[PDB]
Amino acid sequence: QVLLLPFPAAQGHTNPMLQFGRRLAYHGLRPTLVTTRYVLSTTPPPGDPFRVAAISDGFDDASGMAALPDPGEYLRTLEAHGARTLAELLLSEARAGRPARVLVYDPHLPWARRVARAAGVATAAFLSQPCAVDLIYGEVCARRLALPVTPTDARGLYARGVLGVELGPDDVPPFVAAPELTPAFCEQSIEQFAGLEDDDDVLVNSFSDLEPKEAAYMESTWRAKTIGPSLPSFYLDDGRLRSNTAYGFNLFRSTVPCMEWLDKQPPRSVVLVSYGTVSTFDVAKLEELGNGLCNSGKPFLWVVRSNEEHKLSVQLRKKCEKRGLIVPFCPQLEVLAHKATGCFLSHCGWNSTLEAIVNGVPLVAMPHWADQPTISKYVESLWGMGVRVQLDKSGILQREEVERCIREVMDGDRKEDYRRNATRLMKKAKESMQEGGSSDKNIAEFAAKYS
Ligand SMILES: O=c1ccn([C@@H]2O[C@H](COP(=O)(O)OP(=O)(O)O)[C@@H](O)[C@H]2O)c(=O)[nH]1
C-alpha cells in the first residue's frame, strides 16, 4: 500500500527511506521496500513491518554497476528495465487487492515519477541530502541560477536569507560548481527537481532547527516537509517503537567485531574513521589517512571496506595494531553512541553527519564530493561541531593535517565548544523526531493523508 523505492544498493538512500517507512507503519500504514532482484537475492529482507517487491535493472544475477562502470550508462540501463518492471509491479499489486496508495521514491530515479503518475499512483519525492544542497540544485533546475554555481551566486542566497552560511569555492556543491568533472552526476542532481512541483508530496531527511533558513525556503518553494533525522527510534530516545534500534537492510556484512574492543577503551578517547560506503581511496590516500591516525596517538576504530582493504598494505595494517582496530563494516550508530567514542573523522555523507549529530559526537570533516563539501562547511561554521581538513595545493590530504585536525577537536582550546555545539544540535534533533516535534508532525500529516 505504501511503496518505497530507494536508489538500489545505495546505503545512504535506503537507510533513511526505510526508517521513514517504519514511522509510517507505526501510524498504521503498510510499507513495502522496492529494490532490484539482484539486491534482493544477495541481501536478506528487512523483515516486519516490511514487505519486499522486486524490480529489475537488467542485471538480475550480477552487480549491474561493476559490470557497467560508467555512471551515465548504468542509469540508462536501470531506467530501461526499471521503469518497465516498476509498471508491472503496480498492476500486479492492484490486481491482488493491494494497490499502491503512494510511491515514495528517490528523485535520483525520475522515471519512478513517470511510471507512477501513469498509473495514477500518488508520488512523494524523498530527498536524502540536506536542504542547503537541495535548494541549490533546485535553483538550477528552475533556471533561477546559472551553471556554474559560484561563491557569488551563493552569497546572494545568503544575503537574501535563504542560505544561513556563506559558501566559498570549496563549499559550493562540486556537481554544479565544477560540472565538468562530473557531467552525469551534475544532470542527475538537477533532474531531481524536474517534475517535482508535480509530486503529491516532497520530503527531505532533515529537521528545521538544523537548517532553519534552508528548510523554510524548501517548504515554501517546493512544498518539502522535513521528516528527519530519519534514524532508528532508539537513538532519538523515542520509545514509541521499542524494537527500532538498528537499520535493518545493511548492504555490507560485518565480519570483524568491534564492540568488545570499544568497551576496553577509555571514555571519549576513540576516533571513529570512515569515508562511507561509496567513495574509494587510492593507495597513497589510505597511507596518509592511516599514518595520520597512528601519529595522533589516540585509539581509533578505522572502517576500511572489504572492497577497499586490498589497497591497504601489510606494513601499514601492522602499524595500526598498536592503538587502532580495522574492520570492514561497523554498527556505526552503535559505535557513535558508545561511551568510548570521542570524535568522528568522516567524509560527512549526510547520514553519517546526522548520526554524529544525534549522538553529540564532534566531527573531523574530510569531504570528497556531492553534498559533503557543503555539509563540511556547515559543520565548521554554523553548527560549530568540528573542523574540516585543509587540503594542500595539489588537493592531497596529508598525514600532518589529519593528526592536526584530530588533536584540534580532541585537545584544542575549542574542544569544549565542538562538544557543546554537537550536544546542542543533538537535543534539537531528538526533539524534532520525538512525539510532538517538528519532523514528527510532518510524518504524522503524511501518514494521515494516505490512511
Ligand atoms: O561501517 C559502516 C559504515 C557505514 N554505515 C552506514 O552507512 C551509511 C552511510 O551513509 P552516508 O550518507 O553517511 O555516506 P555514503 O556511504 O552514502 O556516501 C550511514 O547510515 C552509516 O551509518 C554503517 O552502518 N557501518
Side-chain angles (χ1 to χ4, degrees), residues 127-137 193 204-207 210-211 214-215 218 348-351 353-354 370-372 374-376 378 383:
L127 286 59
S128 74
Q129 303 206 322
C131 294
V133 163
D134 300 332
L135 83 306
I136 291 176
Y137 293 160
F193 284 83
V204 57
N205 181 17
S206 194
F207 62 105
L210 185 62
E211 315 178 81
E214 303 80 358
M218 286 289 294
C348 274
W350 187 229
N351 302 291
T353 306
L354 287 176
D371 44 348
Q372 302 151 15
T374 312
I375 292 165
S376 301
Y378 274 79
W383 303 341

Side-chain angles (χ1 to χ4, degrees), residues 27-40:
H27 290 304
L29 280 61
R30 339 177 208 194
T32 313
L33 168 61
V34 172
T35 198
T36 70
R37 214 131 44 209
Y38 171 69
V39 167
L40 270 193

Side-chain angles (χ1 to χ4, degrees), residues 133-147:
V133 163
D134 300 332
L135 83 306
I136 291 176
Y137 293 160
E139 296 304 288
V140 165
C141 195
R143 313 151 178 292
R144 272 189 299 285
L145 208 63
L147 284 190

Side-chain angles (χ1 to χ4, degrees), residues 74 77 100 117 134-135 142 157 249 284 298 300 365 375 417 426:
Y74 180 68
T77 315
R117 207 138 296 154
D134 300 332
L135 83 306
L157 289 173
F249 202 65
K298 325 282 178 180
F300 61 87
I375 292 165
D417 306 305
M426 172 178 63

Side-chain angles (χ1 to χ4, degrees), residues 178 194 202 210 244 360 393 422 439:
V202 177
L210 185 62
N244 187 17
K393 62 169 195 168
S439 289

Side-chain angles (χ1 to χ4, degrees), residues 10-13 15-16 128 247 250 254 274-279 303 327-333 346-353 355 369 371-372:
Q11 193 77 85
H13 291 203
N15 278 352
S128 74
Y247 295 117
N250 289 333
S254 287
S274 181
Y275 48 85
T277 68
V278 183
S279 287
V303 186
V327 310
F329 208 62
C330 75
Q332 160 159 325
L333 260 167
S346 168
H347 71 312
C348 274
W350 187 229
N351 302 291
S352 292
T353 306
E355 287 165 5
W369 66 79
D371 44 348
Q372 302 151 15

